[PDB]
Design a protein around this nucleic acid. Structure first.
Ligand SMILES: [Mg+2]
Ligand SMILES: [Mg+2]
Ligand SMILES: [Mg+2]
Ligand SMILES: [Mg+2]
Ligand SMILES: [Mg+2]
Ligand SMILES: [Mg+2]
Ligand SMILES: [Mg+2]
Ligand SMILES: [Mg+2]
Ligand SMILES: [Mg+2]
Ligand SMILES: [Mg+2]
Ligand SMILES: [Mg+2]
Ligand SMILES: [Mg+2]
Ligand SMILES: [Mg+2]
Ligand SMILES: [Mg+2]
Ligand SMILES: [Mg+2]
Ligand SMILES: [Mg+2]
Ligand SMILES: [Mg+2]
Ligand SMILES: [Mg+2]
Ligand SMILES: [Mg+2]
Ligand SMILES: [Mg+2]
Ligand SMILES: [Mg+2]
Lengths: 150, 141, 129
RNA sequence: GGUGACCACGGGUGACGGGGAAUCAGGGUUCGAUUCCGGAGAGGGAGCCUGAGAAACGGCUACCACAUCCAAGGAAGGCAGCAGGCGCGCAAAUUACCCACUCCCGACCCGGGGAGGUAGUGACGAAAAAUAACAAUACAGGACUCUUUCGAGGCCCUGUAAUUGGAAUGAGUCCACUUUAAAUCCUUUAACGAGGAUCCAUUGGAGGGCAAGUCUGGUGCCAGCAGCCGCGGUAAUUCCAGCUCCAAUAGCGUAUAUUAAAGUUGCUGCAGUUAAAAAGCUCGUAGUUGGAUCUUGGGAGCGGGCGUCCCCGCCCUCUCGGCGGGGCCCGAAGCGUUUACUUUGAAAAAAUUAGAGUGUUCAAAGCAGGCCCGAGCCGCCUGGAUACCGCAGCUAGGAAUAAUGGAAUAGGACCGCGGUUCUAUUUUGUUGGUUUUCGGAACUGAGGCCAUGAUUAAGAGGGACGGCCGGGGGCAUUCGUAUUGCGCCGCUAGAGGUGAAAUUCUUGGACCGGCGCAAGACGGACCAGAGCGAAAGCAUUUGCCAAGAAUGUUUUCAUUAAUCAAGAACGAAAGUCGGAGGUUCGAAGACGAUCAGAUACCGUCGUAGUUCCGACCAUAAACGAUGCCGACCGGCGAUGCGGCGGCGUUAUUCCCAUGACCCGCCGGGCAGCUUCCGGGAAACCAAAGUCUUUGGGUUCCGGGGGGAGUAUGGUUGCAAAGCUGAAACUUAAAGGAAUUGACGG
RNA sequence: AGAAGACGGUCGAACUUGACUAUCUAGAGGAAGUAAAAGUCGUAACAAGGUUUCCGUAGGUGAACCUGCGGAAGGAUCAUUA
């Protein structure tokens, strides 16, 4: 079930049992690597690097072809954002909602959604703190959120 | 549903002693209000002095005059009403006698058609009421 | 959420058996589930079963033989010693003639008769009869 | 600084703690003032002397409270020690004898001990056990028997009244003995001691529960009985008695505390739609609970018999191996985590509990006791076990389940080689000097190798991405007729309203019709067992702003999750305050009706409000009277969204898409029909199922009905009130679902 | 060798005031709730109970109750036709 919604959907990807690379995929390991480097230097998150790589160049799974995850490859070279992508979009969503609430203070629904989003931010941040991805004193503040994002 | 976790013993025990206050027997036996309110003060029997002889009407379906006595207890000086449970034992009672008074039989609750009488007379003037009723011994004249 | 794969496996077996079906499919497969099925099958309360291997936690297809009355689980895995294993036998088994309590011991997952035979206690897993 | 929701601190205790006692499926629930161990006190506090040991009290000092004698100048107190008193009470013994036993004290074989022993009172309680047995007559009864009912006796047990009818014993009188410090009791044993064996068995009952009378007299809703149902108003099986029966029995009744009963406190093991009950909804920290995954498989004779059953051996390393150089051997050091868990061992007072032995005359008990004596037996054989003793702590095994770790910007492991500070010791034995690099440890640079090192990606979750979807939310904008009012026009005496009326408006032109204007509300029909939203709730057009479910996904992170005390956001209507606006409707109020009355239902007005903005309030039958997450368990036809397929018809064009239908499939929804899945008290419910075959995780919450959501305290609020929340007392039913009847304007 | 006694210090009973905290209890009068029952007034709930009932809220009335707004069916409708 959804964490903050009364939904029980099932939409998710289903990886094939065959882990072997397709025989028609002519791109080699470092070829997939360098394409990732170009797309990341264009300013792309690992989630949308995998989308464009699976779509245009026909790679099934970056992890299957290159032996490692996209974020593992980006962090190994040293061009991955310190703020994790799933966290970054959460602060960005909260910033947009807070900005909208300032013009519309009678939008009680948006105040409710802001509480849910902020809760997801704080739960995710607590998880990253215990995994040492985030600094121990990394505090998400509603005031300095805008500078923390973008 | 009730928690069955291996480390929930604190919540299970706290919930039990919290919920135990919700039944009458545990509440009256541990709060102490019933003990204070009891004219006998937790005693099976208590002595008193017959203030006067009184008659009490029975409840609605029955029709009789139950023979009782108003008696104040020699300890703590509380005025109560005590039944005289035989055919003619009120005649044995008279003004200003020391009477042993017991509960009527269901723990501070009125019994039968007698309204609001929790007590009954066991002995009067140090001689048993059953002994006087059966003629085994007599009032000291 | 799913917090006891063995509980879901045993409840699925019970429901299919009560329904009378010849086969049952358990979606999450585990080592504990497989061992539990092995001790049941050795005693004869179920038939052969297959472990369908996907790269995730696999599935299991169990051949029900129609001779399983109940295959419940005891979710809080209490510490059962040998001095109080008799109380669990009286509380759980339908009789002293048949029925089995499965408890994981340091010598492996086994029934209570075998656990007593090699003089070892452990955590109670479930029961079947 | 320390301690706290893992409950500190504070309060209460009718709390000395424990060994233990009661109840006894298991689990538990109560009680432990009380003889054993530990503690505390000696009327309440306090301070001291001596002594090894005292903050001693049958030691002192002072004060406080009582209180003793006095010649009034003074003196002397501590029974919660044994007796015995007063008081208090429902509630508890003799102002007895003795160191003989167990021990203790002392300078001590000798003295002392209200410790203790003995006896007295003692129905607390526990064990044993009298109040009668036998024989033969009569009358029944028995499968009785003999002829097959009819009569008797070759048989068996009871019964009723009898010179029966003569045997046995105690309970008592009472000699001696015995015991004992002296006694007493008991055990022996002389002599008496039983035929209403009058040497006298009682306490409660006889409608049901619950064993036992439809007996007789009295009473007559009175007296009374009756724990609960109920009995009693004239032939009462229930009262008062007589008789007869029943129950237990030297014991039975009553009151009250407590245990089982009570699965009516539920961990085992209760419930929450309608009976009592799930918060209006959501977030959320404590708390609790958490997907799968890391050694499996194979072996050698010993082997539950390779006897393919398998006792089972499983086919860590390095240091002297203590039997500076022997193979005949097994000790010193650490764990290639930390725990939890399980098994073993050690240590765990006795009594009590269970339990071994033991004829105490049996038994409760107790820890004793048994064998031979042919009399020299000039003494032998034993026992005084064992189990259990939670939790915590100690020791050694095992490593399944559960938690926790290692190497990720490699400041990673191993193997060696460079790179720096001191130090055990030598003997370069006449001292002195020693080289002592002497051996090892101090910091470190360049390497080789590690298969170099990241489990998978949950029909878990989060996030990204794509197209759509929706009375979802906010802001602005737009339209609609209607209502009311107003301005001009036309003809008329009515209009309005009701069951009938009346109040009210009306030749001043009411109502009606027409053309217009203004205002503030409200968004019909389309509108559905349809959509969205966490609920409350959300419906004119268009735009903007963020948001969201579902579907699609071979995208990304990798456990980030579920429920949640405390805390927090939202929360219909009504209500409160401030400011606008007030069309309609309309609490209050007035009048008119109606009625016996009518403070109403009906009608005409009409205030607050209803509308908007802001600030409060936090409540609804806030309902599905029904927690959330997860798994599983029937069928069928629809419907909303998204997606995937396929005959065909349609839209346009020149083909495909793409829309409108048609036939299916998948997933998520709102629901529906049916079913002997199953459940339930049933109504009914595919959940309210998977429940005595009882345990997926986790919140809230109920405990007969009233009093009562009251009182009081606290807290919130401008108030109204909200949240939290008893007790005394009272009551035998209150309730739920179904059934039949009766009744219905 | 040495008694009374005195200074200072320290324990510190006891007393006075004050504060806080636990219980117990008196009280003119007021306002409830129970029980009794046979009283007066009306008939609010039960049938569409004669205005359907009930919930929250606000106002009003001798009394039960009435009325406004929003809600529920535990209703007197599981249904109302292109
Ligand atoms: Mg005490
Ligand atoms: Mg004690
Ligand atoms: Mg002392
Ligand atoms: Mg001395
Ligand atoms: Mg003293
Ligand atoms: Mg006698
Ligand atoms: Mg009689
Ligand atoms: Mg009981
Ligand atoms: Mg119950
Ligand atoms: Mg209810
Ligand atoms: Mg939490
Ligand atoms: Mg696991
Ligand atoms: Mg008129
Ligand atoms: Mg409102
Ligand atoms: Mg106003
Ligand atoms: Mg009006
Ligand atoms: Mg749960
Ligand atoms: Mg109650
Ligand atoms: Mg007054
Ligand atoms: Mg009414
Ligand atoms: Mg009515």
């Amino acid at each position: 079930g959804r964490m903050h919604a009364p939904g029980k959907g099932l939409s998710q990807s289903a990886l094939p049992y065959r882990r072997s690379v397709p025989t028609w995929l002519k791109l080699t390991s470092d070829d997939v690597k360098e394409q990732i480097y170009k797309l990341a230097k264009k300013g792309l998150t690992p989630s949308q690097i995998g989308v464009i790589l699976r779509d245009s160049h026909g790679v099934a799974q970056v992890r299957f072809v290159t032996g490692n995850k996209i974020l593992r490859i980006l962090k190994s070279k040293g061009l991955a954002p310190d703020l994790p992508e799933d966290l970054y979009h959460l602060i960005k969503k909260a910033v947009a909602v807070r900005k909208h609430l300032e013009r519309n203070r009678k939008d009680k629904d948006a105040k409710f959604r802001l509480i849910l989003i902020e809760s997801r931010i704080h739960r995710l941040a607590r998880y990253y703190k215990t995994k040492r991805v985030l600094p121990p004193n990394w505090k998400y503040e509603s005031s300095t959120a805008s500078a923390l994002v973008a | 549903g009730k928690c069955r976790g291996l480390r929930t013993a604190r919540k299970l025990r706290s919930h039990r002693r919290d919920q135990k206050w919700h039944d009458k027997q545990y509440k009256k036996a541990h709060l102490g209000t019933a003990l204070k309110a009891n004219p006998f003060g937790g005693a099976s029997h208590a002595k008193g002095i017959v203030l006067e002889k009184v008659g009490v009407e029975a409840k609605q379906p029955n029709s009789a005059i139950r023979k009782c006595v108003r008696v104040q207890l020699i300890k703590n000086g509380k005025k109560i009403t005590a039944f005289v449970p035989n055919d003619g034992c009120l005649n044995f009672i008279e003004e200003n006698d020391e009477v042993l008074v017991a509960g009527f039989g269901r723990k501070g609750h009125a019994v039968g058609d007698i309204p609001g009488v929790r007590f009954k007379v066991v002995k009067v003037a140090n001689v048993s009421l059953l002994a006087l009723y059966k003629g085994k011994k007599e009032r000291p004249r | 959420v799913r917090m006891n794969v063995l509980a879901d496996a045993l409840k699925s077996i019970n429901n299919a058996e009560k329904r009378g079906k010849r086969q049952v499919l358990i979606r999450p497969c585990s080592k504990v589930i497989v061992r539990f099925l092995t001790v049941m099958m050795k005693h004869g309360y179920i038939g052969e079963f297959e472990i369908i291997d996907d790269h995730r936690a696999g599935k299991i297809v169990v051949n029900l033989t129609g001779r399983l009355n109940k295959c419940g689980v005891i979710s809080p895995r209490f510490d059962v010693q040998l001095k109080d294993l008799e109380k669990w036998q009286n509380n759980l088994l339908p009789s002293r003639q048949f029925g089995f309590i499965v408890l994981t011991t340091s010598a492996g997952i086994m029934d209570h008769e075998e656990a007593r035979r090699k003089h070892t206690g452990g955590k109670i897993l479930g029961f079947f009869f």
